[PDB]
Every structure is written in structure tokens, then in C-alpha cells.
Amino acid sequence: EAPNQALLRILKETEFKKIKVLGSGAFGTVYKGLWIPEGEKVKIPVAIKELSPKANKEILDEAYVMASVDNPHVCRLLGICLTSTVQLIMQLMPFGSLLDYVREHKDNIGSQYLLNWCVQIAKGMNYLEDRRLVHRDLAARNVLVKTPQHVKITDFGLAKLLHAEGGKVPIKWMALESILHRIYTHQSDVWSYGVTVWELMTFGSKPYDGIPASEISSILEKGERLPQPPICTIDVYMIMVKCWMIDADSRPKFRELIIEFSKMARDPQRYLVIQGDERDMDDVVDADEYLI
Numbered sequence: 001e002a003p004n005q006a007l008l009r010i011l012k013e014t015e016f017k018k019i020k021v022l023g024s025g026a027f028g029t030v031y032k033g034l035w036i037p038e039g040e041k042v043k044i045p046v047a048i049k050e051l052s053p054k055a056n057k058e059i060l061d062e063a064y065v066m067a068s069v070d071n072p073h074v075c076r077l078l079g080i081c082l083t084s085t086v087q088l089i090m091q092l093m094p095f096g097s098l099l100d101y102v103r104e105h106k107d108n109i110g111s112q113y114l115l116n117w118c119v120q121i122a123k124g125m126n127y128l129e130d131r132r133l134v135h136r137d138l139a140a141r142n143v144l145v146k147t148p149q150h151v152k153i154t155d156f157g158l159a160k161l162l163h164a165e166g167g168k169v170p171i172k173w174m175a176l177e178s179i180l181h182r183i184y185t186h187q188s189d190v191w192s193y194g195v196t197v198w199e200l201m202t203f204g205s206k207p208y209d210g211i212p213a214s215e216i217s218s219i220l221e222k223g224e225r226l227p228q229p230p231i232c233t234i235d236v237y238m239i240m241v242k243c244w245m246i247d248a249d250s251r252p253k254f255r256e257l258i259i260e261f262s263k264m265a266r267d268p269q270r271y272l273v274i275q276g277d278e279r280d281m282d283d284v285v286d287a288d289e290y291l292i
């Protein structure tokens with residue numbers, strides 16, 4: 001396989017200011033912050049993630065993956081910070097996760113935005129497929145909003161470079177072959193993409209709500225799937241159901257999903273039916289403009 005010439009960038013802690021906690025949870029807390037490269041006269045809005053030798057081992061594996069990807073629909077790592085427990089410095093996505101955003105603004109989200117997000121997530125995933133990377137945890141919570149017009153895929157803690165494995169994982173986004181056999185493919189990412197689209201089309205509902213994860217395996221086996229969303233035409237709902245087929249070779253490819261959702265994005269009202277669809281920081285630079 002080709003040699004990975006990606007540059008790991010080490011960043012000085014004295015160059016960052018942690019401003020507020022963006023989130024806390026199972027992982028180490030994520031901070032909003034400012035990165036001021038010395039002598040460069042730029043202020044770069046960043047998100048800093050920190051969770052012990054087991055912690056540093058897991059965070060440098062994610063830094064390995066994120067340092068090796070360069071696409072507009074994939075979250076970008078700026079560098080790492082050599083703290084006793086290593087810090088991941090990434091680009092700040094000001095609007096949070098697409099899951100939260102779609103819930104907070106459901107009364108103002110139209111069909112043009114929903115289908116454009118579907119195109120953009122598929123472009124991210126098609127890029128990860130070109131790089132032989134299996135994300136394994138695609139979900140609306142792992143798609144971040146830079147602007148409502150631009151979204152990027154952001155969580156690589158489970159990603160693997162093509163997969164058999166052992167460990168904890170989110171069952172309600174997983175392809176049935178993964179639940180039963182711990183197998184993962186780009187095609188099983190397609191299954192989670194369908195669930196992610198369903199999360200968007202229902203303005204942020206939880207799949208298989210109030211059903212134990214232990215039950216999900218046999219619900220899927222008997223032939224059951226997630227319901228058609230109210231806003232959804234059979235055209236859109238059929239694409240989801242195709243991602244949830246049993247034969248993984250039968251599900252669509254990410255390059256085909258780009259085409260399909262792109263076509264539906266030219267006549268959005270024909271494919272999604274939503275009521276009232278028609279209706280000192282001077283030196284700040286976004287990470288996407290600060291190159292080297």
C-alpha cells in the first residue's frame with residue numbers, strides 16, 4: 001500500500017486559550033478555544049478534545065486517521081498538543097452537530113438544506129472509501145455544522161483502514177452483518193448512512209425509540225426497518241430502505257448516493273414535502289483558509 005506522507009503537526013499549548021466547555025461525556029471533554037500561531041498574526045477558532053497510557057494510545061490513533069484525510073466534507077485536524085494526556089486540536093464547527101441543529105431549528109429547515117446535507121455526507125463518505133477507510137460510527141451526531149450550507153464528518157475514534165473487532169459500539173446505526181458478525185465494510189457505512197438520513201428526515205428522532213439494543217438484532221432479522229418519515233416521498237424513502245438491505249453488495253454505493261441526492265436537490269419540493277418550504281476578532285481566520 002502507498003506510503004502515508006501526511007504531516008503530523010505538533011502545537012505549543014502556550015498558543016491556545018480554552019474558552020468554554022463545548023461538551024462532556026463518555027469521551028474527554030471538548031473545549032471551544034482560540035489558536036494564535038506566534039508571529040503569524042492570525043486567530044484560528046479551534047475545538048480541543050482531551051480524555052493514562054491507555055488514553056494517549058487511543059487519541060494518537062485518532063490523530064493518525066484525521067491527519068491522513070483531506071476533503072472539504074471531512075473534519076480537519078490542525079495538530080496535537082504534547083500534554084501529559086494528549087490534546088487533539090481540530091477546527092471549530094460553530095453550529096454544533098447536525099443532530100442538535102436539526103432539532104433546534106426544525107421549524108426553519110427546508111428540503112433544499114436536507115438534501116444538500118445528504119449530498120455532502122455522501123461526498124465525505126465516498127472520499128473515506130477512496131482512502132480505504134471505514135468510519136464505523138456514522139450518525140447525525142458525528143456530522144458537524146460549519147455553516148448551515150456546509151457540514152463535515154467528524155468522529156474517527158472507531159475508524160479502521162481496510163474488518164473484524166471486539167468492543168462496545170452503537171447498535172441502532174449498525175449493519176446487521178456487524179451486529180451478528182463484527183464485520184465492517186464501506187457497505188456497512190452505507191447502512192449507517194441510511195439511519196443518518198432518517199435522523200435528518202425526521203428532524204432528529206431517535207431510531208427504534210425505547211427499544212433495547214438487545215432487541216434490535218432480531219427486529220432487523222425478521223425484516224423490520226425504520227418507518228417512512230412524514231416529509232418523505234417514496235423516492236427518498238426507497239433510497240434509505242436500499243441502504244438497509246441484507247445483502248451488503250445490494251445497497252447503493254456512496255458515489256451513487258451523491259448522484260441521486262444531487263438530482264433530488266435540483267427539485268427539492270418534488271422529493272421532500274415540508275409545510276411552508278418557501279419561507280476583538282479582526283484577525284480571525286477559519287482553519288480552512290489557514291494553510292501551510
Ligand SMILES: CN1CCN(C2CCN(c3ccc(Nc4ncc(Cl)c(Nc5ccccc5P(C)(C)=O)n4)cc3Cl)CC2)CC1
Nearest residue numbers: 022023030047090091092093094095096097100141142154
Ligand atoms: C440545546 N443546547 C443548546 C446549545 N446547543 C449546543 C449545541 C451543541 N454544542 C456544540 C458542540 C460543538 C460545537 N462545535 C464543535 N466544533 C468542532 C468540534 Cl470537534 C466539536 N466537537 C464536539 C463538541 C461537543 C461534543 C462532542 C464533540 P465530538 C465527540 C462530535 O467531537 N464541536 C458547537 C456546539 Cl454549540 C454546544 C451548544 C445545543 C445544546
